Coordinates of C-alpha atoms and ligand atoms in Angstrom, one line a residue:
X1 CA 180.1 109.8 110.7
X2 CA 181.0 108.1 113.7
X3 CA 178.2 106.0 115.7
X4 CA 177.0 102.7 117.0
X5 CA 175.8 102.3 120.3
X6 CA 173.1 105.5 119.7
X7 CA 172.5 104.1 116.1
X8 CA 171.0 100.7 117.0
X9 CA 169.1 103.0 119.6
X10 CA 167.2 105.2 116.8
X11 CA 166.6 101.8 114.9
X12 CA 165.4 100.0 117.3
X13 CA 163.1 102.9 118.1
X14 CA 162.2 102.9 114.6
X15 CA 160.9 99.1 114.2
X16 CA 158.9 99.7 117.3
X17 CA 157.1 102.7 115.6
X18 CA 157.0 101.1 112.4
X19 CA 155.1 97.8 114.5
X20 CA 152.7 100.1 116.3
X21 CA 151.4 101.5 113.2
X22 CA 151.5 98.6 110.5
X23 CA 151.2 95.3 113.0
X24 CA 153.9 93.3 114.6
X25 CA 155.3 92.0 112.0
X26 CA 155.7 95.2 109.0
X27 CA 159.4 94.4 109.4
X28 CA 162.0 92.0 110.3
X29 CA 165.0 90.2 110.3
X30 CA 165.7 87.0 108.2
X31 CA 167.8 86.0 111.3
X32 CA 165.1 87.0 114.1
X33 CA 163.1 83.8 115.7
X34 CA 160.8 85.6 117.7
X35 CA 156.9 85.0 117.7
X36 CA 155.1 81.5 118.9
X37 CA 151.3 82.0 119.3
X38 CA 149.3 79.6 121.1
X39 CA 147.0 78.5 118.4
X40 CA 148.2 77.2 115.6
X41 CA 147.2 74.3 112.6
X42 CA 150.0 71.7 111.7
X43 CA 150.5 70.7 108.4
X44 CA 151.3 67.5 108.8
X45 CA 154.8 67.8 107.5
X46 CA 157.1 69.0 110.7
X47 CA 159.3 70.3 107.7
X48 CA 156.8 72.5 106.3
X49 CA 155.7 73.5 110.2
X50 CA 159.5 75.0 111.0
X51 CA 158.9 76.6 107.7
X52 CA 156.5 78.5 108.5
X53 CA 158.1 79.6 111.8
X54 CA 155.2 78.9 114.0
X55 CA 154.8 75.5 114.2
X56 CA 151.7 75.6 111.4
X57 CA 149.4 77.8 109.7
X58 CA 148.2 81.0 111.2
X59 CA 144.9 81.5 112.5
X60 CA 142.6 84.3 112.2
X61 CA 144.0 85.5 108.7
X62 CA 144.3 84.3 105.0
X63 CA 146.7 82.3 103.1
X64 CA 146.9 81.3 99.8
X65 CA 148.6 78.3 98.0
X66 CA 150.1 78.7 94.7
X67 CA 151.6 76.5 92.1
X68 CA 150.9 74.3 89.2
X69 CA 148.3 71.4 89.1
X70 CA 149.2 68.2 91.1
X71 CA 152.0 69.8 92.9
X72 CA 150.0 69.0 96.5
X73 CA 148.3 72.1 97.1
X74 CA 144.6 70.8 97.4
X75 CA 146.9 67.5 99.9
X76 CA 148.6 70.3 102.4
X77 CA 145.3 72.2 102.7
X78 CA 143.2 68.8 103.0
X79 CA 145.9 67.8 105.7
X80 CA 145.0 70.9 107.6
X81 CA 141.7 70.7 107.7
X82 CA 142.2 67.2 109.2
X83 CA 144.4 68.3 111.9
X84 CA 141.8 71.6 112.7
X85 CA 139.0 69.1 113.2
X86 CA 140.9 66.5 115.0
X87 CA 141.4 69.6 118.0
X88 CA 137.6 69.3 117.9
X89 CA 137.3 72.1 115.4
X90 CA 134.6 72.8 112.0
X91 CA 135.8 73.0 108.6
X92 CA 134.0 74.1 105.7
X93 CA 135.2 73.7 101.8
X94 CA 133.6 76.5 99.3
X95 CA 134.1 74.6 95.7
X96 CA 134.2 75.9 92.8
X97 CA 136.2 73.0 91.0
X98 CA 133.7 69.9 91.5
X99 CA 137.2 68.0 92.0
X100 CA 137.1 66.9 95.5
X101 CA 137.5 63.5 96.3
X102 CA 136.2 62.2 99.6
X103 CA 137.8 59.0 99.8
X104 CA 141.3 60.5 99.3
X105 CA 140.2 63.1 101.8
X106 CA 139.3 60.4 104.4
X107 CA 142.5 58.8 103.4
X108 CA 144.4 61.8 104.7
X109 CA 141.6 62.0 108.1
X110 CA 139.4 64.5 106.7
X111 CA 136.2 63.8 108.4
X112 CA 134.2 64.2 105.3
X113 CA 130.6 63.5 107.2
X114 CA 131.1 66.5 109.1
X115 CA 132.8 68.3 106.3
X116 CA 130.3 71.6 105.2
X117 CA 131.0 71.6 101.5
X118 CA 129.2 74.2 98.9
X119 CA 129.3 74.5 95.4
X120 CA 128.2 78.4 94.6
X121 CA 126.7 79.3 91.1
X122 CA 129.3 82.5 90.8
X123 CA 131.9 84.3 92.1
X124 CA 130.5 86.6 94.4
X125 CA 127.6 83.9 96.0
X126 CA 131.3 82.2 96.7
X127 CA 132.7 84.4 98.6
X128 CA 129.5 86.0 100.3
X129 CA 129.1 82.5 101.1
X130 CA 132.4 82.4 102.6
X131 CA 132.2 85.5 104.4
X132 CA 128.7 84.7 105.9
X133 CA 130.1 81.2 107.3
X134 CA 133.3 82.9 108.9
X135 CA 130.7 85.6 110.6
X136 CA 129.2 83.2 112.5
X137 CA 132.4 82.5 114.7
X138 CA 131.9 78.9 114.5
X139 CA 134.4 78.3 111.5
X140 CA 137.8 77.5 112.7
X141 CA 139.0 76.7 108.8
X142 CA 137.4 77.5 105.5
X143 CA 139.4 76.4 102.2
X144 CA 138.3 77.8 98.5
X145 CA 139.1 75.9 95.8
X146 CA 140.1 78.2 93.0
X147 CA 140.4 81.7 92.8
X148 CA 140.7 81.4 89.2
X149 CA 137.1 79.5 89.3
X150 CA 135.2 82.5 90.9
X151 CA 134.2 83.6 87.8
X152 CA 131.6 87.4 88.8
X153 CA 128.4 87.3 87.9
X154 CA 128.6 89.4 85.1
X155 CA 130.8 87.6 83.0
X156 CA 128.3 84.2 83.6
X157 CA 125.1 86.3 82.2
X158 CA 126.7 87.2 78.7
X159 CA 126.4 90.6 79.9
X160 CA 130.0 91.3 79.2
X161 CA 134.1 94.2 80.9
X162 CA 137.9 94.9 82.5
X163 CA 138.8 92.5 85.0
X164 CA 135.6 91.8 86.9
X165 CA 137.7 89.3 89.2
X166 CA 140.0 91.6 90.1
X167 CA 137.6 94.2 91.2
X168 CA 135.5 91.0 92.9
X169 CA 138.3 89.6 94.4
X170 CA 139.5 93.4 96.4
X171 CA 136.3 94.2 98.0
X172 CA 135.8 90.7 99.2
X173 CA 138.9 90.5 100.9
X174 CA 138.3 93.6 102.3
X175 CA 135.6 92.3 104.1
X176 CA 136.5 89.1 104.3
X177 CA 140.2 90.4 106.4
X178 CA 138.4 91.6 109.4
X179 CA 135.9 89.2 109.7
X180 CA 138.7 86.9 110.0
X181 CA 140.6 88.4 112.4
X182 CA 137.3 88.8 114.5
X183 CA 136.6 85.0 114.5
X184 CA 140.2 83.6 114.2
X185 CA 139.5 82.1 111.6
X186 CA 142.5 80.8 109.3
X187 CA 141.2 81.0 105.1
X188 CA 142.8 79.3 102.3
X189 CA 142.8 80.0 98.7
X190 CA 144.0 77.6 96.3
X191 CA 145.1 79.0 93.3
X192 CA 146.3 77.0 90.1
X193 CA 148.3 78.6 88.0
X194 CA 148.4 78.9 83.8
X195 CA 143.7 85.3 88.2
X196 CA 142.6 87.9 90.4
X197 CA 145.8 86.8 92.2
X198 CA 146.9 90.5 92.3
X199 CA 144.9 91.5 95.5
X200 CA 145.3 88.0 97.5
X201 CA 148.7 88.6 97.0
X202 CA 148.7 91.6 99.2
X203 CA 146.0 90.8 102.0
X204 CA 147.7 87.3 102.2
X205 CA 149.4 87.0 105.4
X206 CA 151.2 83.6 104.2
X207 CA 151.6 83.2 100.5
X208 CA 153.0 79.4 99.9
X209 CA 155.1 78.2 96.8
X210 CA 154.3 74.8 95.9
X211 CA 155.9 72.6 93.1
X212 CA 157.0 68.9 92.4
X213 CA 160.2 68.3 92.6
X214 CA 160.7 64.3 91.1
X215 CA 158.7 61.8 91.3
X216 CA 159.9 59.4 94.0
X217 CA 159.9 55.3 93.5
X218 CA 160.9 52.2 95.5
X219 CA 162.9 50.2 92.6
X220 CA 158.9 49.9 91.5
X221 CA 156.9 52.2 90.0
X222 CA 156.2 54.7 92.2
X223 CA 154.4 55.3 95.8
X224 CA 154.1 59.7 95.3
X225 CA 157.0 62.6 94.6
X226 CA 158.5 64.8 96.2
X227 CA 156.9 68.3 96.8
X228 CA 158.8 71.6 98.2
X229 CA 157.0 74.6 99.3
X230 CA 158.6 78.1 99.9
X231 CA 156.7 80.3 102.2
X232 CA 157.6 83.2 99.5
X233 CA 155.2 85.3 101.9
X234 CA 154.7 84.9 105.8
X235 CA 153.9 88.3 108.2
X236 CA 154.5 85.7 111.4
X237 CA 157.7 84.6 111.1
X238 CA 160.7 85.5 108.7
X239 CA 159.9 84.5 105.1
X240 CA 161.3 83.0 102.4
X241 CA 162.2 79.5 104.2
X242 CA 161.4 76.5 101.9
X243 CA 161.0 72.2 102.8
X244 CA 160.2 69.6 101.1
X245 CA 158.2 66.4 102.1
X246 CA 156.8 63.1 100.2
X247 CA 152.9 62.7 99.2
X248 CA 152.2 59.4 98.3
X249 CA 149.8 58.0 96.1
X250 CA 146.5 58.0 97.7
X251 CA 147.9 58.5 101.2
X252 CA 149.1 62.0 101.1
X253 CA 152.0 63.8 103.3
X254 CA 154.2 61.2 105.0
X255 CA 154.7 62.3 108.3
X256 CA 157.4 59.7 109.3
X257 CA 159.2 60.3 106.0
X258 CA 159.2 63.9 107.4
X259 CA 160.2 62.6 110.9
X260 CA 163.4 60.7 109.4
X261 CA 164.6 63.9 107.5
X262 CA 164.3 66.4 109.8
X263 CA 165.9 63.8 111.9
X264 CA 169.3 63.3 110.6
X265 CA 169.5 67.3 109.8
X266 CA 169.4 67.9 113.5
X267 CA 170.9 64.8 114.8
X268 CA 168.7 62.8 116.8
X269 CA 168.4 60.2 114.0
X270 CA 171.8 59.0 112.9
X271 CA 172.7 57.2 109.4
X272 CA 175.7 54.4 109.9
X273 CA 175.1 54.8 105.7
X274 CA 172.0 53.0 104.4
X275 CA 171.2 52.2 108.0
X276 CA 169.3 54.3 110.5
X277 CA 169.9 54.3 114.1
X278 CA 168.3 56.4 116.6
X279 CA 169.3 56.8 120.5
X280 CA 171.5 54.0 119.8
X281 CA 168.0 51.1 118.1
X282 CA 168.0 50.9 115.0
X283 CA 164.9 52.0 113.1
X284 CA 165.6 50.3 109.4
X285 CA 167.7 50.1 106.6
X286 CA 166.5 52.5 103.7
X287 CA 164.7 55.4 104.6
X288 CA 161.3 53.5 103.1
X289 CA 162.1 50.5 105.7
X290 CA 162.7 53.4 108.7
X291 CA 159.1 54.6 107.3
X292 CA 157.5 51.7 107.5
X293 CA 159.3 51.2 110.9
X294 CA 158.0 54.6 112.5
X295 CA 154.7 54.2 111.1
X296 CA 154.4 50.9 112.6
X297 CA 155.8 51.8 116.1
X298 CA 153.6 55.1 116.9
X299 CA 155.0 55.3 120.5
X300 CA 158.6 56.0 118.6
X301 CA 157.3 58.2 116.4
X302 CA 156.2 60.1 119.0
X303 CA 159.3 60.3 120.8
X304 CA 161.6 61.8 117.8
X305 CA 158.8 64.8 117.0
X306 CA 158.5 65.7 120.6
X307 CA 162.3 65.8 120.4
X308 CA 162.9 68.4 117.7
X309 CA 159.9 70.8 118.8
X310 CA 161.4 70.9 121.8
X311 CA 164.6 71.3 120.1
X312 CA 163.9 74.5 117.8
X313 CA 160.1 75.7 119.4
Ligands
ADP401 N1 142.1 61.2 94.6 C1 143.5 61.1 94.7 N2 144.1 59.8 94.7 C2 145.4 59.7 94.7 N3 146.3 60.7 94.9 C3 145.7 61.9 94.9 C4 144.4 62.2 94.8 N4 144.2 63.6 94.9 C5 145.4 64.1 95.0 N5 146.3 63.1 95.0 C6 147.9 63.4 95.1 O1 148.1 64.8 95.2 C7 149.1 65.2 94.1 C8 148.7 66.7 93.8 O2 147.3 66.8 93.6 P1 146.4 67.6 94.7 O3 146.7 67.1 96.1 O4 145.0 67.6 94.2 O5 147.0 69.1 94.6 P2 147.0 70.2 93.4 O6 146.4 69.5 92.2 O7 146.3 71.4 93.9 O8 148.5 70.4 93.2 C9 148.8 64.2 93.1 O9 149.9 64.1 92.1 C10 148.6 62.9 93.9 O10 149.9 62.3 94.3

């Protein structure tokens, strides 16, 4: 039948009901834009950070990061715990892995002295563990390593079942989901793959892809790869947007590198071919030499990420 004006009436009715019972957020629009909170943890890739739609990682809720080992998972959440304790904030790291590597993590600005680390005997301990520290409302970032370590209790006393994880895994988050949200909290579960995956999946609020793409050289052997991420699940912003950014070897997510990319795919930072120019200087020939430029010249650097937040939000 005929309609149109009354039509986008009922829907837009609909949404709104839909929102007031489910969140903001139970439906959208790959095209919409809307949403920009006030708090918010960068990634330290501004690629990743338009990815996720709100400039960073939500806060108050959980994420989880998925992919194969030594795609950068363990780098992007070490990278955010930097940045949430750089705004002055406490970050706390539940292991489970005993893989951790300070050095790397001061490397990347993780300071580690301050850094609450725990190694629990079992699955449960973990997580009660985890849940106790986000209680206390003094947590700003809490990162597990492994939900395929949390092995239950049950299954470590030889008093072994059907997926004890799985069960493990749902009532924790249950608990674990409002306690969040009461704090504001922001918790991330690193998850290597080949779980109880099945309920993270679902209480995630962010679920992030990530893989290695090739590793990257310099006409030597090789200074890191690069890694893309697909924010496959994301209840702040519309999902399924993906970027990809260079770790390098011991040094982590390049930030400049990230600068210069998301540079000439919005303009600011022009490239005359193997040269690049910006605001009419130019900044090197190469993209490593335009690296090594920006991340000599800070006050530049600066300039050209200012520039595109003000740009897209
Ligand atoms: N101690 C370290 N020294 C140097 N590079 C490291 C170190 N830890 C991690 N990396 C870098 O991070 C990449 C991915 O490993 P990691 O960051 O641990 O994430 P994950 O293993 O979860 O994918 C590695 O290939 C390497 O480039």
């Amino acid at each position: 039948m005929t309609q149109t004006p009354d039509r986008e009436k009922a829907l837009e009715l609909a949404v709104a009901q839909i929102e007031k019972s489910y969140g903001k957020g139970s439906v959208m629009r790959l095209g919409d834009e809307a949403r920009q909170p006030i708090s918010v943890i960068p990634t330290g890739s501004i690629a990743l950070d338009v990815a996720l739609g709100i400039g960073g990682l939500p806060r108050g809720r959980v994420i989880e990061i998925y992919g194969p080992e030594s795609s950068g998972k363990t780098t992007v959440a070490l990278h955010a715990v930097a940045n949430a304790q750089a705004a002055g904030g406490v970050a706390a790291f539940i292991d489970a892995e005993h893989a951790l590597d300070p050095d790397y993590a001061k490397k990347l600005g993780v300071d580690t002295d301050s850094l609450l680390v725990s190694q629990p005997d079992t699955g449960e301990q973990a997580l009660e563990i985890a849940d106790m520290l986000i209680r206390s409302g003094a947590l700003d970032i809490v990162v597990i390593d492994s939900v395929a370590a949390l092995v239950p209790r049950a299954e470590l006393e030889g008093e072994m079942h059907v997926g004890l994880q799985a069960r493990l895994m749902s009532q924790a988050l249950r608990k674990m989901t409002g306690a969040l949200n009461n704090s504001g909290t922001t918790a991330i579960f690193i998850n290597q793959l080949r779980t109880g995956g099945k309920a993270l999946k679902f209480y995630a609020s962010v679920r992030m892809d990530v893989r290695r793409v090739e590793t990257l050289k310099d006409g030597t052997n090789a200074v890191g790869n690069r890694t893309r991420v697909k924010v496959v699940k994301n209840k702040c912003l519309a999902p399924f947007k993906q970027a990809e950014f260079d770790i390098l070897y011991g040094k982590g997510i390049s930030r400049e590198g990230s600068l210069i990319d998301m540079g000439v795919d919005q303009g600011l930072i022009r490239k005359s071919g193997a040269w690049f120019t910006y605001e009419g200087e130019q900044l090197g020939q190469g993209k490593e030499n335009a690296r090594n430029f920006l991340v000599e010249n800070a006050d530049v650097a600066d300039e050209i990420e200012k520039k595109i937040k003000e740009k897209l939000g």
